[PDB]
Design a protein around this ligand. Sequence first.
Ligand SMILES: [Mg+2]
Ligand SMILES: [Mg+2]
Ligand SMILES: [Mg+2]
Ligand SMILES: [Mg+2]
Ligand SMILES: [Mg+2]
Ligand SMILES: [Mg+2]
Ligand SMILES: [Mg+2]
Ligand SMILES: [Mg+2]
Lengths: 374, 374, 374, 374
Amino acid sequence: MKITDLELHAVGIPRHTGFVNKHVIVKIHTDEGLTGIGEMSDFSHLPLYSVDLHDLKQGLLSILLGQNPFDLMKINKELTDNFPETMYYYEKGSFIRNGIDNALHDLCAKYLDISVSDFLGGRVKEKIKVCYPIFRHRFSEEVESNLDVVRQKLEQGFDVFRLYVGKNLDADEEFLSRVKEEFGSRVRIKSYDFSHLLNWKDAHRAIKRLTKYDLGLEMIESPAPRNDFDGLYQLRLKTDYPISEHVWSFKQQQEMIKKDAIDIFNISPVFIGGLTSAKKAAYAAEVASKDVVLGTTQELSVGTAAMAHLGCSLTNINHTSDPTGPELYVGDVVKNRVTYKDGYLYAPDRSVKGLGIELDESLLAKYQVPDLSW
Amino acid sequence: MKITDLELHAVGIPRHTGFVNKHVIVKIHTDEGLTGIGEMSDFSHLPLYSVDLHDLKQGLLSILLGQNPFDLMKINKELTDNFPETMYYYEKGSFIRNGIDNALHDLCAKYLDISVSDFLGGRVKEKIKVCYPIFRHRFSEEVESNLDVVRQKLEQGFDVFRLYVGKNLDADEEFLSRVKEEFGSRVRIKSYDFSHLLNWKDAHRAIKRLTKYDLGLEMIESPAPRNDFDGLYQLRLKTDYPISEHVWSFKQQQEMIKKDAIDIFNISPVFIGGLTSAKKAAYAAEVASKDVVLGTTQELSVGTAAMAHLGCSLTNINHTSDPTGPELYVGDVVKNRVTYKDGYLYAPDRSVKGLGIELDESLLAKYQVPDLSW
Amino acid sequence: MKITDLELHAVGIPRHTGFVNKHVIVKIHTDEGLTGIGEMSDFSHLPLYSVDLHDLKQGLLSILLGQNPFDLMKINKELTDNFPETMYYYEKGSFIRNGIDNALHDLCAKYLDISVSDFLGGRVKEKIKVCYPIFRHRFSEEVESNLDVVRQKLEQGFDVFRLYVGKNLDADEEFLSRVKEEFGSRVRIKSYDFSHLLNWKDAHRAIKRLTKYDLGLEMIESPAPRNDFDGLYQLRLKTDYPISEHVWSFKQQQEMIKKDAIDIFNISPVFIGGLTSAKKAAYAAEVASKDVVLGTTQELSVGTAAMAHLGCSLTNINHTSDPTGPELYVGDVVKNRVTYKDGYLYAPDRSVKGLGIELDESLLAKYQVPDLSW
Amino acid sequence: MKITDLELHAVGIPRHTGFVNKHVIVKIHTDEGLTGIGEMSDFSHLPLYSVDLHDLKQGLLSILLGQNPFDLMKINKELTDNFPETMYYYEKGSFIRNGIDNALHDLCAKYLDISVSDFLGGRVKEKIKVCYPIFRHRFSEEVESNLDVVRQKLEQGFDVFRLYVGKNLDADEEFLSRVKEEFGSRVRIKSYDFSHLLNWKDAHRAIKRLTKYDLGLEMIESPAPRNDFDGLYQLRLKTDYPISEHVWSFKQQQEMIKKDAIDIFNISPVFIGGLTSAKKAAYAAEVASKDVVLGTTQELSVGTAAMAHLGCSLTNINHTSDPTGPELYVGDVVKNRVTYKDGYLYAPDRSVKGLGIELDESLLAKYQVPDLSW
Ligand SMILES: [Mg+2]
Ligand SMILES: [Mg+2]
Ligand SMILES: [Mg+2]
Ligand SMILES: [Mg+2]
Ligand SMILES: [Mg+2]
Ligand SMILES: [Mg+2]
Ligand SMILES: [Mg+2]
Ligand SMILES: [Mg+2]
């Protein structure tokens, strides 16, 4: 059983807001005709340079050609050797490794005629609670528009949201006051996300006035600069609420564990390099008796499905997660877009082998983009 | 696909030394006729009390009956809920969980018609280097006998050994001097194992005189009392050689990681509760950029095979391991025992489904024992 | 003067709630006809396995046979060698050592024709204040039932209780509000016990809202996971109230002392291995200028009497203790069940030699159980 | 059973060197005619003031009169309340409490018709290894004289000595060189005692040149100023050999434990206030997994016997102790002095009740002194 070819399809699916994110859909072919599909989700992040996909395909074929897809540990070591972890949130090498490793999981599962769920340790639950994002306000003039978003997603079933804060605290505060006023307990904002834009002391001040509003608040995310482990720790000690942070490299995670800097590890395959790497991160968290939540970069259906299977196999997810990427796009490239019901992401049909998602050649062709250029 | 019955066979296989260790061979049956086999290896350790196997079978059936063997994460959480980690090296609950989880791996692999190796992440190598143990001297009068053991195992291919030290340093020293003298570089003693019997400062003194002899020395193991994390750390700082310690609970491992107390994590399924738990421990080590070696409690072929598959799937095993249990027994309960050659333990033929080991009913009957009584 | 035989009687005494706890009553016979009695209190705790009493009797006879009961230090070292401390709250080896050491105290005292009190250092007081437990609420619907419990025990003299909290804070809060309302200062809740189910930060949040009600509150017990010494310390620093924790091993106690992690050491013979071990723990606490309280696992009269003698001999017990085990059972196996008056546990009659409690063969036969099976 | 009177006899027994040390022999009488004897050993230490024995007798009678001698915990708390621990090596209050508590142990044991050994926890061994002291050299001219002392005590059975060092390192070095030369391995110097006269760094330098000679060296004692816990710790880290220090108060011991400042706790009843306090110190050491040795202030037979019983009841004495006080005096006030054989102190005949030592009125009369004046 061996890998014989690889395909990288660049696609651009516009968000309802108009901005077009670029993704790379992965196909790994074998000698027995089985093909695994994966997704190098959202390349549209800084740094402001783009990867040559023709060159990339050659490099990856050099790595995978002739290999046994079941040698996940071996292949992942080789992938990491060529695309080293960078300690940077949006390292493009992580997105690349992610697409390949996830496609490998789909491939192996298909070969074994089982769901990716059964290749990941089975089911602990059938679905995980997720939230819809409300992006940070810059002016109080945006509050009204965001209240409309909340009302709309709420009727569609999303009763939990996460709010990006830090730019305009007066606006953040107005929004929260308005939601509490109009929706009462009908809606919950499980997280106030600072996205690393404030130093911990400024975050503490913000946290102090924002938490005046507690609508089912579960965590404060990224309340310190990237990799400021000591700052996270100090803030963790002054904050009643759990502190969460994204995991972007094992080195970074190792340091936050050693220092007991955070309470919840926000893990997402795309940022750590795939399902294999995400499981390791999740297990490291488990060994350290720490909670986990699934994060997101706004992936499409194929990338979101990966997390659906992973999330339903973990025993240490006790809070609301973030993967609602499909909700932000006008379309996708699959035959069956992932489904959200009552603010929940369900694991794909367990009787369907592989990832449980199927690509649609017509859509792949429709959203096709020449390259990943900016 | 569900579990329908469970069998626990207590057996007593005498060591070449005469002492009879007791083990419990596990069989997990399903509705489709597939059966997984496992081993609750060596119950003959303190505390000086024994488990009622009739009661145990009922308790475990209560847990497993009707479950889908592929729900490893779910089942393991339930197993840990009923047999909590104890922070004690020889917690019998660990041996119990181990036998069940390993049998589940064999069961799932058989169902999928693949080797346990392919269910664990594939192969990184086809074999791992192991060592044969030379137990601690009490009197210098024992040195000669142990030199005979070294000469015998060496001609059988074992060129690497581990030496238990700490009781009689003069005897330890004579042995090492004699081996260096007679065998030169033909033999290596990869570890000096104190087995937690000395406080770190006394170990440091011992390490100082013993390391005068360096025959391919790779590590100093358990040079401090059980759970003395601070002592291990201090000793790690004063010792040039890597410090290794057995992993017996996630809490203990978490603390040694946070404190950077050791250099090599000695992991063995039996002491941590099975393959699922051992993989998590191995991955936590990997995430922390720490080395791993496979340890042992002197298991039989079924338990040793588990480590053979695990060991060949890990990318962070860069030292010699310890599983040579079968070499200490006069027999086993399998059709074909594990295979050693030139001091290496080979992972069973990847073409064979399951664990690649098969029970022998007549041998099971032959070594059968009524209970686990002392 | 030597030990000639040993007897282990397994018994099951149902609680008023119906659940039947199993205990093992101990009898140690000598060559001079004197017999010491002890109690391996409440074996009904996880792990979910049970000890073979036939095997256990053989192992213990192997240890005790022919020994001089007055060699307590020697015998206890040997007991600990065979039943090592585990760092786990409910290590069955502790229960076993406890029953033997306590029976030895009874035996020696009888031989000397003095009360166990006079063998333990005499009297500092004649009784110690204790409290009755109110188990944790899961639903607010249980509050009424627990208020009835409080009213009933209060009229029987128990004006002090301990409350298990952490599962449903809204329910915990309602209960406390209701008691303050109905009983005012007539009743005191000396402790809010989290039983290690919350990580320290979540406990801190709970402590913050629960302590809004202070009905003679004396301590916050186990507000962190088992063995989370650093967490206890951090919480100790953020909490005005004393922090208490159970002592289950010398290693654990040593760490909480070194780190100044807690304010009150909750000591109970059953969890530390007997009177000899409990005295050492109490004295270590004294040397460290730390307060002590006697804890419980809900023992019967024989086990409770042990604590009555111990408690009245210590000079560092300045808070309310927990041993009201007999109050939860429908019966016992003694001729004289322990005395509770005005919420106080009195030390047995000092003029009666030994423990001051006598077994009742008829009751022993009535509550006899064939084994410790689950 | 109650205390009815107390007697304090001041005595002066000259050392073979001529200097006359003063001690106070204690007698505690009861209503049943039983009398306990104790010893307030060696009052001849700074500070340069002396205690009024007439006043002291009144103060102690005020405390003890009418009390039940078996109330050791109660009486000791009261003794400590009136003679608080001082954190100073030679606090006279400790000597005072010691004499009373030890007399109480003798009294209780006599009442029960058992050996003090059986009142202290029994026997673990029948004797403990001790050493003879060689006082510090000031001039190299003293070396010869001390070699004569070694040769003399060696033929009498004392093959182990302790050497006081620090004043003249050249002399210390010559002595050690001369002993190694003349006696070879016939003699051992188990400890180099600095007696707190050097700051830790100067001690380290001394330790470096003195340990060039290792004649069965077991420990380095008091290598730092009194109560310099941090200095002891730092030195403990730079020294291969165990570091030992005398225990003179629970506060001091608590700090050395918390800081892990030493390896061996040198405990002596006289410096800590008696058998009751010495046992607590020994147990605190045990709970902390630390080794213990019995120290000395050069007591007579009654005080030395106390340690003989204590020493043979402890399980954590794994090194040579120091009580050879009787060997330095020309006489005593007992009918039969303690027994040494081959460098061991034997616990008095266990079949003899009480301390196993009896006073000689004739000797008491001939050695009596008017007071404790300097
Ligand atoms: Mg975020
Ligand atoms: Mg993105
Ligand atoms: Mg080992
Ligand atoms: Mg073993
Ligand atoms: Mg409690
Ligand atoms: Mg209990
Ligand atoms: Mg000294
Ligand atoms: Mg003196």
